[PDB]
Amino acid sequence: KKPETPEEQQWLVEAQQAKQGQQDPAMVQAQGVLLQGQAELAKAQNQT
Amino acid sequence: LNMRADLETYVFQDNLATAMRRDGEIYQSIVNDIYDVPRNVTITLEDGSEKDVQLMAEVVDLATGEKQVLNDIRGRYECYTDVGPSFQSMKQQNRA
Amino acid sequence: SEKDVQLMAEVVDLATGEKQVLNDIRGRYECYTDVGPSFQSMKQQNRA
DSSP, rough: OOOOSSOOOTTHHHHHHHHHHHHHHHHHGGGGGGTTTHHHHHHHHHOO | HHHHHHSSHHHHHHHHHHHOOEEEEEEOOOOOOOOOOOSSBBBBSSSSSSOOSSSSSOBBBBBOOSSSSSSOSSOOOOOOOOOOOOOOSHHHHHOO | OOOOOOOOOOOOOOOOOOOOSSOSSSSSOOOOOOSSSSOSHHHHHHHH
């Protein structure tokens, strides 16, 4: 929606940055199951 | 249409003879400290040069007590004259 | 007139009242007329 402020920013704007910082590591966490293939090659090359 | 006309006078008649009721200003008395915007005058976090941003409020319809009760604004623009479903109590509308 | 938007002093539109009122813009046109359903508020149009 983006901020529509009657005068408010105490909750709206404040928690907008907090939610943005919650979302971004959670995407990496969810994509981490597909990332298991690249980690398998990474440990193999180091083990060699 | 005729009912909407009788509903133009409703607040004016209600405020003396039912007493109370006031419509004020959206901005409120306490002034604390204004909170940040990206450098002043923008539409990204204000409405423009229009308004200002402080605290959390939106309320305009609320009634003062002052040192003596009954204080009423002489003109009101908040809600426009319209009709709809029949409710003669708030709790009847709360269910519906 | 328009080739620029946003440089952090943004006002899209605000009324000209000057020193004393009873003045207006002489370019009273940036808009074309149109006919649609009954709207007696911004809110009514936002619902439909």
